[PDB]
Amino acid sequence: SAEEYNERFMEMWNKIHDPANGYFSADGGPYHSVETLIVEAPDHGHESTSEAYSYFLLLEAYYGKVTGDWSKLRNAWAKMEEHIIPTQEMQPTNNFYNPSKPASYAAEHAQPSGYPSQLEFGVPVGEDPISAKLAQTYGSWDVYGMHWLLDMDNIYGYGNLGDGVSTPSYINTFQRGEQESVWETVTHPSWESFKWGGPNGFLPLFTKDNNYSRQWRYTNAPDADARAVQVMYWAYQWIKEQGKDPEQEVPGLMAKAAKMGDYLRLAMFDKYFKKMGTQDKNAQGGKGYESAHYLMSWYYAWGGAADANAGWAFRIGSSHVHFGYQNPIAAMALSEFDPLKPRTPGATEDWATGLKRSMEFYTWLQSAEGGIAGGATNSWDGSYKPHPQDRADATFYGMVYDENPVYHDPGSGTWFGWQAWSMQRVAEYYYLKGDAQAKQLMDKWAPWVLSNINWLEDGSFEIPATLEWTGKPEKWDPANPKANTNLHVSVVDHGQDLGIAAGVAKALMFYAAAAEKYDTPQNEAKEASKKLLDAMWTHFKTPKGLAAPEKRGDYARFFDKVYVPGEFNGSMANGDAINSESTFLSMRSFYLDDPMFKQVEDALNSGEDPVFTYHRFWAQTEAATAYANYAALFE
Ligand SMILES: OC[C@H]1O[C@@H](O[C@H]2[C@H](O)[C@@H](O)[C@H](O)O[C@@H]2CO)[C@H](O)[C@@H](O)[C@@H]1O
Ligand SMILES: [Ca+2]
Ligand code: NA
Ligand code: NA
């Protein structure tokens, strides 16, 4: 029944919202995870992410759907704005920004030891063709987008605006290229007041310059902003399905969603607004949209000098594009659905171009077997180097194929989770529009997944976890696309990642629903969806939601040394040292007081991998909502 699956969702929703289970901080924002000791993208479980906020929106949107009560969604959007979108006071100097000269170039490097990277004021940067028009639209130079990373409990001691106290605290980590794993960062405040770090705060870890100024900067995760917009598209439909009025149920939120998708266009540009196909850092930069790829790149970022003695601000897009970030639902909403169309002239056209280009990108990256390959870069080696001869033909509108876009430790192509996150969105598009390109993609992707799930003796399962890639796609040709017969993927590891299992279930259910509506039924997809969901319910119940144990041998890296320059002498807020003998743990010695830490040490001291059972907000939300989703589609 529908009512049973809806009850499973409600039970989960109740668990997530019961304060005894610890999903939310003192300020009412989701944590990454209930458990504090966890290292993967954030480096503590009581960090939070724009991803978590986007999932908080999803959770409360389904609660609306099921119950008629939209107040939870109103609350979630308000918490997002309050916590994770910098107020004017927190982004105080966007008036310094010059869209004709958006930033100054620094190379990326193949190891963190490459950093700090020299700012090269003789290297041309292209024009930003959107910021001035966004500022005119909204009456403000400020950016309305989520920063990616918060410290919810002030565990690093930065507070906000240099205050050492306020929560959620804006922080950042990753800054030192493709080999800077989550283990190798130095966690630093978004507001750089030179209070901590060295004499010039944390800045000289990252960029070399003659002068260092106090400053603020934020870094967007486009996949999370895109997800927020996707959720609101669905929320609108669900409200209308109840015969209610979105302007009474979620007043102002569609307009704020369309604003966020307006600024999210910054993700569609090369890092330094270089022309597509740029293969020399010295090349004159783009004008207008010459530097647009129209996809959801790895980030956009913006920042500004604290004061007029310095008097600068910057914006950058990203030159790395991973398939796992794309979102045809957000692009279709922002280009076609009136209540979410952004107001800045051009913005509906860019998103229409984005929607098309993203469907070409999934097609271009589809392996012989069905999995989607990593993505592409407009900056080979993060220095606009020449495209290597061994992949020189493998291009997509000027960008070259990259099997592991952005990061290599571990490879960003190797995680199966991206398959599920991004293909769910294609499956939704197939469902919504009966789109032929989406159908063809999913016809090839769905059975590759199904073929690689192992059903276990006890009724449980293992899904694909880790991937290995060989080869390259053919040169993209939208007029005559070639079969990528020399791009291959193998599944080399399986696991019980229930967040990813739920995302597979959802991709499968939308694919099956779409097929029944528009083509021939795909009963195996539908049954596999249901089996996953039922096997999770009957094998992985916990007091806090649905979770499976996981081995984390990677936690040996707590004790790894981290690159810090010889000239750099710094302190963390708790007085931990930042120097050339620092390790991940020695700069995060609060972990010594965490109960789970003793368990890591004891396990590693016994020659064993530690084992944890995690309740990640995004996963518990994905699992909870997958029950509601199935009931909505099939009952
Ligand atoms: O960076 C992508 C994504 O990773 C999530 O953690 C993964 C981790 O990358 C994978 O190695 C581990 O085996 O499974 C976990 C859980 O799926 C992290 O939870 C996300 O926040 C992050 O966006
Ligand atoms: Ca105006
Ligand atoms: Na805010
Ligand atoms: Na590394």
XYZ file of C-alpha atoms and ligand atoms in Angstrom:
661
model
C 0.000 0.000 0.000
C 0.725 3.730 -0.356
C -0.219 4.202 3.270
C 2.530 1.672 4.417
C 5.336 3.414 2.471
C 4.063 6.749 3.651
C 4.209 5.463 7.212
C 7.838 4.384 6.671
C 8.623 7.926 5.537
C 6.792 9.418 8.497
C 8.596 7.115 10.997
C 11.908 8.233 9.449
C 10.867 11.885 9.434
C 10.008 11.537 13.146
C 13.403 10.028 13.912
C 15.193 12.822 12.078
C 13.227 15.525 13.892
C 13.372 13.945 17.379
C 15.982 16.034 19.221
C 17.069 12.882 21.121
C 18.590 11.634 17.871
C 20.910 14.610 17.326
C 20.455 15.385 13.592
C 20.267 19.164 14.090
C 22.530 21.728 15.837
C 21.557 24.150 18.652
C 20.671 26.615 15.906
C 18.271 24.270 14.123
C 20.436 23.529 11.088
C 21.230 19.941 9.977
C 24.566 18.443 10.756
C 26.413 16.461 8.160
C 25.912 13.409 10.370
C 24.710 12.543 13.874
C 28.123 11.039 14.711
C 31.006 13.508 15.129
C 33.967 11.408 13.894
C 33.686 11.171 10.169
C 36.007 12.350 7.432
C 35.011 12.368 3.727
C 34.154 15.762 2.287
C 33.526 17.648 5.392
C 36.132 16.605 8.044
C 33.886 16.501 11.131
C 30.259 15.283 11.373
C 29.172 18.481 13.067
C 30.165 20.493 10.134
C 27.323 21.058 7.709
C 27.190 21.558 3.960
C 25.061 23.263 1.400
C 24.317 19.679 0.261
C 22.762 18.972 3.744
C 20.703 22.147 3.463
C 19.456 21.099 0.037
C 18.448 17.750 1.487
C 16.716 19.501 4.402
C 14.603 21.262 1.824
C 13.824 17.822 0.138
C 12.899 16.303 3.499
C 10.423 19.028 4.422
C 9.035 19.248 0.813
C 8.082 15.547 1.076
C 6.599 16.217 4.522
C 4.465 18.889 2.877
C 3.482 16.464 0.130
C 2.427 13.735 2.561
C 0.719 15.830 5.206
C -0.420 19.166 3.705
C 1.744 21.076 6.166
C 4.202 23.394 4.303
C 5.459 25.086 7.431
C 8.387 22.732 7.678
C 9.491 23.786 4.205
C 9.110 27.482 5.088
C 11.300 26.821 8.093
C 13.949 25.009 6.130
C 14.311 27.797 3.546
C 14.503 30.377 6.373
C 17.192 28.311 8.148
C 19.135 28.119 4.862
C 19.004 31.868 4.420
C 19.892 32.522 8.026
C 22.791 30.079 8.205
C 24.454 29.536 4.881
C 23.815 32.475 2.520
C 26.171 35.349 3.683
C 24.323 38.419 4.847
C 25.440 41.876 3.504
C 27.559 42.353 6.649
C 29.278 39.057 5.864
C 29.950 39.929 2.175
C 30.522 43.713 2.739
C 32.646 44.709 -0.225
C 31.170 43.415 -3.416
C 31.083 47.123 -4.412
C 34.809 46.670 -5.112
C 34.031 44.103 -7.838
C 34.902 44.859 -11.477
C 33.262 42.423 -13.868
C 35.717 43.516 -16.533
C 38.587 42.275 -14.429
C 36.966 39.580 -12.261
C 40.026 38.044 -10.609
C 43.790 37.492 -10.804
C 45.184 34.216 -12.101
C 47.112 31.682 -10.027
C 48.032 28.277 -11.355
C 46.762 25.092 -9.773
C 49.391 22.434 -8.890
C 49.572 18.669 -9.034
C 50.459 18.416 -5.234
C 49.671 20.563 -2.172
C 53.482 21.157 -1.975
C 52.947 23.364 -5.101
C 51.230 25.947 -2.912
C 51.113 28.784 -2.119
C 50.517 29.556 -5.796
C 51.933 32.773 -7.205
C 49.385 35.405 -8.287
C 50.249 36.281 -11.914
C 49.045 39.784 -12.632
C 50.278 39.580 -16.223
C 47.921 36.712 -17.101
C 44.665 37.900 -18.798
C 41.370 37.071 -17.181
C 38.103 37.246 -19.280
C 35.011 39.352 -18.731
C 32.164 38.331 -16.376
C 29.118 38.943 -18.578
C 26.477 38.451 -15.869
C 27.328 40.060 -12.541
C 26.510 43.665 -13.568
C 23.104 42.534 -14.843
C 22.434 40.486 -11.705
C 23.311 43.537 -9.591
C 20.849 45.650 -11.580
C 18.108 43.014 -11.250
C 18.318 42.722 -7.452
C 19.509 46.177 -6.433
C 22.673 44.916 -4.856
C 26.256 43.712 -5.602
C 25.786 40.847 -3.112
C 25.633 37.147 -4.232
C 22.583 35.060 -3.287
C 24.003 31.526 -3.177
C 24.923 29.069 -0.511
C 28.534 28.801 0.778
C 29.371 25.090 0.900
C 30.771 24.459 4.424
C 29.759 25.374 7.934
C 31.128 24.533 11.421
C 27.849 24.062 13.282
C 29.207 23.668 16.851
C 32.157 26.116 16.479
C 34.473 23.176 16.883
C 37.336 25.048 15.088
C 36.744 28.147 17.181
C 36.452 30.726 14.376
C 32.897 31.931 14.923
C 31.999 34.504 12.229
C 33.547 37.805 11.226
C 36.598 36.830 13.355
C 34.568 36.643 16.559
C 35.549 33.162 17.764
C 31.974 32.491 19.040
C 29.042 32.693 16.505
C 27.422 29.672 14.962
C 27.029 28.259 12.313
C 30.642 29.390 11.582
C 31.605 29.888 7.945
C 34.692 27.834 7.149
C 36.605 26.316 4.302
C 39.159 23.536 3.690
C 40.029 22.564 0.134
C 42.343 25.031 -1.593
C 45.461 23.171 -2.824
C 44.567 21.297 -5.984
C 43.718 17.720 -7.121
C 46.007 15.888 -4.728
C 44.803 17.760 -1.623
C 42.566 15.049 -0.142
C 40.184 15.754 2.813
C 43.178 14.593 4.963
C 45.563 17.251 3.643
C 43.708 20.527 4.150
C 44.107 23.315 6.686
C 40.653 24.296 7.967
C 40.348 28.068 7.922
C 37.701 30.805 8.451
C 35.894 32.276 5.463
C 36.433 35.678 7.187
C 40.188 36.287 7.263
C 40.976 38.838 10.022
C 44.551 37.475 10.602
C 43.491 36.529 14.142
C 44.558 32.862 13.714
C 47.002 31.231 11.293
C 50.241 33.177 10.915
C 50.860 36.933 10.852
C 48.727 37.096 7.614
C 46.237 34.472 8.779
C 45.940 31.427 6.534
C 46.453 33.267 3.217
C 50.103 32.435 2.602
C 49.278 28.714 2.577
C 47.343 29.219 -0.620
C 48.418 32.270 -2.685
C 51.789 34.103 -2.847
C 51.523 37.833 -3.152
C 53.618 40.862 -2.202
C 50.899 42.104 0.069
C 48.257 40.275 2.026
C 45.053 41.923 3.046
C 42.377 40.971 5.350
C 39.396 39.636 3.307
C 36.275 37.448 3.094
C 35.495 34.642 0.566
C 32.835 32.054 -0.059
C 32.720 28.887 -2.242
C 29.566 27.571 -3.765
C 28.770 23.844 -4.437
C 26.631 24.178 -7.582
C 25.160 20.691 -7.310
C 23.573 21.683 -3.926
C 22.112 25.021 -5.177
C 20.772 23.173 -8.237
C 19.226 20.606 -5.965
C 17.516 23.371 -3.898
C 15.891 24.710 -7.092
C 14.818 21.144 -8.151
C 13.154 20.662 -4.794
C 11.164 23.888 -5.098
C 9.986 22.882 -8.640
C 8.574 19.690 -7.114
C 7.194 21.488 -4.061
C 5.238 23.814 -6.310
C 3.628 20.866 -8.184
C 2.820 19.101 -4.888
C 1.185 22.174 -3.390
C -0.945 22.597 -6.595
C -1.823 18.846 -6.446
C -3.413 19.549 -3.036
C -5.454 22.392 -4.509
C -3.432 24.847 -2.474
C -1.707 28.063 -3.505
C 2.099 28.259 -3.410
C 1.963 31.951 -2.618
C 0.070 31.193 0.583
C 1.955 27.964 1.488
C 5.555 28.997 0.733
C 5.284 32.843 0.309
C 8.322 34.314 -1.429
C 10.191 31.017 -1.848
C 9.780 30.477 -5.569
C 11.128 34.005 -6.140
C 14.124 33.263 -3.837
C 14.698 29.943 -5.623
C 14.696 31.662 -9.006
C 17.214 34.274 -7.550
C 19.522 31.510 -6.341
C 19.365 29.894 -9.846
C 20.097 33.331 -11.354
C 23.407 33.628 -9.398
C 24.074 29.886 -9.924
C 24.937 30.839 -13.504
C 28.377 31.899 -12.200
C 29.073 28.071 -12.154
C 28.683 28.022 -15.977
C 31.939 29.887 -16.687
C 35.556 29.006 -16.869
C 37.500 29.784 -13.617
C 39.151 32.817 -15.061
C 36.557 33.451 -17.825
C 39.047 32.044 -20.397
C 37.725 31.059 -23.742
C 36.582 27.498 -24.221
C 39.466 25.531 -25.722
C 42.140 27.697 -24.073
C 45.518 25.894 -24.136
C 47.875 28.686 -23.024
C 47.464 30.573 -19.741
C 48.712 33.708 -21.565
C 45.806 33.781 -23.968
C 43.578 36.882 -23.917
C 40.411 35.988 -21.955
C 36.865 35.662 -23.139
C 34.391 38.330 -23.938
C 30.681 37.689 -23.385
C 29.843 33.968 -23.407
C 33.071 32.794 -25.063
C 34.047 31.490 -21.598
C 30.730 29.748 -20.893
C 30.484 25.961 -20.802
C 26.811 26.246 -19.546
C 27.299 23.340 -17.128
C 27.421 22.990 -13.345
C 31.159 23.223 -12.780
C 32.877 22.258 -9.465
C 32.400 25.654 -7.902
C 31.964 29.282 -8.140
C 33.604 31.540 -5.584
C 33.538 35.157 -4.587
C 35.402 37.342 -2.209
C 36.532 40.840 -1.309
C 39.155 42.834 0.566
C 38.065 43.893 4.010
C 38.803 47.538 3.224
C 39.468 50.369 0.835
C 43.279 50.378 1.337
C 43.176 47.105 -0.669
C 39.927 47.862 -2.505
C 39.506 44.665 -4.607
C 36.966 41.888 -5.012
C 36.877 38.763 -7.111
C 34.665 36.126 -8.685
C 35.709 32.911 -10.339
C 33.788 30.066 -12.010
C 35.455 26.627 -12.448
C 37.187 25.035 -15.446
C 36.498 21.390 -14.064
C 33.057 19.887 -14.839
C 31.946 16.601 -13.310
C 28.919 14.759 -14.662
C 27.744 14.133 -11.081
C 26.810 17.807 -10.637
C 24.509 18.145 -13.627
C 20.885 18.775 -13.126
C 18.382 18.813 -16.019
C 15.538 19.287 -13.573
C 16.933 22.590 -12.240
C 17.786 23.758 -15.728
C 14.353 22.868 -17.128
C 12.675 24.626 -14.108
C 14.769 27.781 -14.432
C 14.222 27.995 -18.240
C 10.607 26.796 -18.666
C 8.603 26.992 -15.483
C 7.319 30.550 -15.088
C 7.266 30.713 -11.233
C 11.047 29.801 -11.189
C 12.260 31.771 -14.210
C 14.926 34.222 -13.058
C 14.319 37.872 -13.938
C 17.770 38.886 -15.238
C 17.654 39.152 -19.021
C 19.565 36.235 -20.554
C 19.183 33.972 -17.568
C 16.297 31.820 -19.027
C 18.325 31.487 -22.254
C 21.489 30.362 -20.421
C 19.558 27.757 -18.512
C 17.825 26.491 -21.709
C 21.364 26.195 -23.238
C 22.477 24.475 -20.022
C 19.622 21.948 -20.196
C 20.592 20.967 -23.745
C 24.313 20.977 -23.137
C 23.942 18.859 -19.980
C 22.004 16.121 -21.965
C 24.776 16.176 -24.621
C 27.372 15.898 -21.815
C 25.731 12.748 -20.279
C 25.585 11.254 -23.818
C 29.167 12.056 -24.617
C 30.303 10.478 -21.339
C 28.238 7.273 -21.469
C 30.526 4.220 -21.455
C 30.054 1.062 -23.586
C 28.596 -0.536 -20.487
C 26.163 2.198 -19.414
C 27.992 4.055 -16.583
C 28.775 7.691 -17.004
C 32.422 8.751 -17.226
C 33.853 11.658 -15.013
C 33.710 14.805 -17.012
C 35.897 17.403 -18.674
C 38.243 20.361 -18.074
C 38.920 23.626 -19.889
C 42.215 23.937 -17.996
C 44.546 21.002 -18.441
C 46.699 20.726 -15.279
C 44.904 23.845 -13.825
C 47.340 25.930 -16.011
C 45.502 25.887 -19.359
C 48.241 23.539 -20.610
C 47.988 21.965 -24.045
C 45.558 19.077 -24.250
C 47.648 15.871 -24.026
C 48.086 14.146 -27.385
C 46.615 10.894 -26.025
C 43.236 12.616 -25.413
C 43.502 15.554 -27.806
C 40.583 14.286 -29.875
C 38.398 13.551 -26.880
C 36.648 16.983 -26.637
C 33.320 18.540 -25.793
C 32.915 22.133 -26.906
C 36.580 22.967 -26.320
C 37.009 21.018 -23.063
C 38.964 17.776 -22.795
C 37.878 14.564 -21.247
C 38.945 14.037 -17.686
C 38.297 10.640 -16.070
C 38.665 12.193 -12.556
C 37.658 15.800 -12.705
C 38.864 18.167 -9.923
C 40.313 15.657 -7.276
C 42.504 12.473 -7.542
C 42.830 11.370 -3.906
C 40.712 9.355 -4.254
C 39.716 9.699 -7.938
C 36.443 11.612 -8.416
C 35.514 9.136 -11.165
C 35.819 6.158 -8.879
C 32.794 6.768 -6.562
C 29.597 5.079 -7.676
C 27.487 7.575 -5.750
C 27.736 10.205 -8.548
C 26.027 7.684 -10.888
C 22.999 7.549 -8.671
C 22.751 11.247 -7.830
C 22.991 12.551 -11.351
C 21.119 9.709 -13.110
C 18.238 10.089 -10.781
C 17.880 13.490 -12.242
C 17.869 12.188 -15.840
C 15.299 9.635 -14.758
C 13.117 12.453 -13.378
C 13.438 14.331 -16.649
C 12.425 11.166 -18.577
C 9.439 10.952 -16.275
C 8.456 14.595 -16.535
C 8.925 15.209 -20.265
C 9.057 11.739 -21.888
C 12.368 12.956 -23.264
C 13.988 10.635 -25.844
C 17.617 11.456 -24.956
C 16.903 10.834 -21.237
C 15.165 7.548 -22.164
C 18.105 6.335 -24.178
C 20.538 7.184 -21.395
C 18.488 5.422 -18.767
C 17.846 2.405 -21.067
C 21.584 1.836 -20.971
C 22.377 2.997 -17.446
C 19.576 1.237 -15.539
C 20.530 -2.282 -16.623
C 24.181 -1.640 -15.989
C 23.261 -0.823 -12.397
C 20.811 -3.751 -12.056
C 23.472 -6.155 -13.418
C 25.951 -5.041 -10.779
C 23.767 -5.279 -7.678
C 24.385 -8.519 -5.603
C 21.473 -9.884 -3.791
C 22.694 -11.595 -0.600
C 21.540 -14.866 1.043
C 19.871 -13.232 4.010
C 17.677 -10.973 1.790
C 20.101 -8.038 1.993
C 22.139 -6.612 -0.944
C 25.363 -4.931 -1.919
C 25.444 -2.170 -4.488
C 28.253 -1.029 -6.628
C 30.697 1.193 -4.617
C 33.899 1.762 -6.488
C 34.598 2.088 -10.221
C 37.572 1.743 -12.464
C 37.684 3.468 -15.878
C 39.775 2.892 -18.992
C 39.678 4.663 -22.351
C 38.111 7.866 -23.660
C 34.879 8.955 -25.218
C 34.887 9.728 -28.984
C 35.084 13.362 -30.033
C 31.627 14.854 -29.298
C 29.503 15.584 -32.395
C 25.987 16.693 -31.523
C 24.860 16.302 -35.185
C 26.194 12.747 -35.517
C 27.036 11.289 -32.071
C 29.451 8.304 -32.072
C 29.190 5.154 -29.952
C 31.841 5.297 -27.197
C 33.040 1.798 -27.830
C 36.443 2.465 -26.293
C 35.221 3.976 -22.983
C 34.844 1.224 -20.320
C 33.918 0.991 -16.695
C 34.202 -1.912 -14.237
C 32.710 -2.219 -10.815
C 35.620 -3.214 -8.629
C 34.052 -2.975 -5.122
C 30.556 -3.331 -3.594
C 29.047 -2.000 -0.403
C 25.919 -1.228 1.613
C 25.859 2.578 1.290
C 22.170 3.086 2.063
C 22.135 6.759 0.972
C 23.360 5.637 -2.458
C 21.072 2.593 -2.360
C 18.077 4.913 -1.845
C 19.239 7.172 -4.748
C 19.460 4.064 -6.960
C 15.958 3.066 -5.851
C 14.735 6.535 -6.857
C 16.424 6.519 -10.203
C 14.964 3.102 -10.876
C 11.403 4.068 -9.831
C 11.275 7.197 -11.935
C 12.715 5.181 -14.866
C 10.025 2.503 -14.446
C 7.271 5.107 -14.001
C 8.465 7.025 -17.138
C 8.632 3.760 -19.192
C 5.050 2.771 -18.279
C 3.833 6.268 -19.224
C 5.703 6.700 -22.498
C 7.151 3.433 -23.847
C 7.131 -0.239 -22.721
C 7.026 -1.102 -18.977
C 10.255 -1.885 -17.232
C 9.105 -4.110 -14.495
C 12.605 -5.307 -13.376
C 13.542 -1.637 -12.596
C 10.347 -1.191 -10.571
C 10.762 -4.437 -8.682
C 14.449 -3.777 -7.996
C 13.489 -0.352 -6.547
C 10.961 -1.918 -4.266
C 13.328 -4.702 -3.186
C 16.047 -2.307 -2.257
C 13.592 -0.296 -0.190
C 12.135 -3.341 1.479
C 15.565 -4.950 2.143
C 16.735 -1.670 3.795
C 13.621 -1.603 5.994
C 13.898 -5.172 7.167
C 17.737 -5.398 7.578
C 19.090 -1.986 8.647
C 16.861 -0.433 11.188
C 18.602 1.530 13.970
C 17.329 3.753 16.777
C 18.113 6.766 14.535
C 17.070 5.694 11.031
C 18.523 3.072 8.572
C 22.233 2.372 8.555
C 24.720 -0.273 7.715
C 28.167 -0.727 9.185
C 31.108 0.491 7.160
C 34.791 -0.184 7.389
C 36.985 2.925 7.436
C 40.572 1.798 6.980
C 41.150 5.237 5.501
C 41.110 6.589 9.066
C 44.831 5.517 9.347
C 45.280 8.883 7.628
C 44.390 10.747 10.841
C 48.123 10.326 11.569
C 49.445 11.372 8.103
C 51.722 14.416 7.873
C 50.296 17.332 6.003
C 52.227 19.734 3.708
C 52.822 23.101 5.288
C 55.512 25.434 3.931
C 58.728 25.919 5.878
C 58.138 29.675 5.984
C 54.614 29.260 7.412
C 54.086 29.374 11.178
C 50.535 29.408 12.383
C 48.057 28.397 15.042
C 44.566 26.950 14.971
C 42.043 28.622 17.263
C 42.541 26.065 20.050
C 46.282 26.714 19.849
C 47.101 23.639 17.755
C 50.184 24.312 15.639
C 50.343 24.714 11.893
C 53.857 23.886 10.758
C 55.926 21.489 8.823
C 55.399 18.643 11.295
C 51.563 19.002 11.366
C 49.280 15.982 10.819
C 45.524 15.877 10.159
C 44.957 15.064 13.896
C 47.514 17.457 15.377
C 45.709 20.433 13.758
C 42.345 18.979 14.989
C 43.275 17.843 18.538
C 39.684 18.244 19.722
C 39.350 14.803 18.187
C 41.395 13.463 21.080
C 38.336 14.082 23.326
C 35.876 12.310 20.921
C 34.747 8.812 22.199
C 34.975 7.446 18.670
C 38.602 8.470 18.398
C 39.679 5.875 21.018
C 37.861 3.317 18.904
C 39.875 4.344 15.772
C 43.185 4.159 17.730
C 42.246 0.832 19.307
C 41.226 -0.625 15.942
C 44.344 0.603 14.100
C 46.483 -0.517 17.102
C 45.000 -4.047 16.639
C 45.810 -4.094 12.977
C 42.085 -3.753 12.156
C 39.936 -1.192 10.262
C 37.593 0.805 12.408
C 33.894 0.147 11.793
C 31.144 2.768 12.207
C 27.465 2.963 11.674
C 26.662 6.444 10.363
C 23.483 8.458 10.138
C 24.341 11.047 7.464
C 21.586 13.675 7.085
C 21.531 13.415 3.284
C 21.331 9.616 3.362
C 18.634 9.373 6.020
C 16.701 11.955 4.043
C 17.231 10.102 0.761
C 16.126 6.802 2.351
C 13.094 8.371 4.145
C 11.926 10.193 1.038
C 12.457 7.176 -1.281
C 9.470 5.443 0.469
C 7.252 8.473 -0.060
C 8.536 8.763 -3.679
C 7.585 5.181 -4.490
C 4.168 5.616 -2.937
C 3.637 8.847 -4.948
C 4.533 7.192 -8.213
C 2.814 3.822 -7.841
C -0.122 4.216 -5.383
O 32.289 13.868 -2.061
C 31.087 13.186 -2.443
C 30.196 12.847 -1.219
O 30.854 11.891 -0.413
C 30.127 11.476 0.714
O 30.908 10.487 1.427
C 31.052 9.217 0.787
C 32.506 8.996 0.506
O 32.929 9.884 -0.528
C 32.699 7.580 0.059
O 34.122 7.377 0.006
C 32.244 6.744 1.245
O 32.564 5.430 1.003
O 30.817 6.807 1.258
C 30.519 8.126 1.714
C 29.018 8.219 1.879
O 28.277 8.137 0.658
C 29.703 12.592 1.630
O 28.853 11.983 2.568
C 28.994 13.637 0.810
O 28.740 14.677 1.725
C 29.868 14.075 -0.370
O 29.173 15.012 -1.189
Ca 17.311 47.359 -9.988
Na 22.418 34.745 6.071
Na 46.985 13.422 -1.860
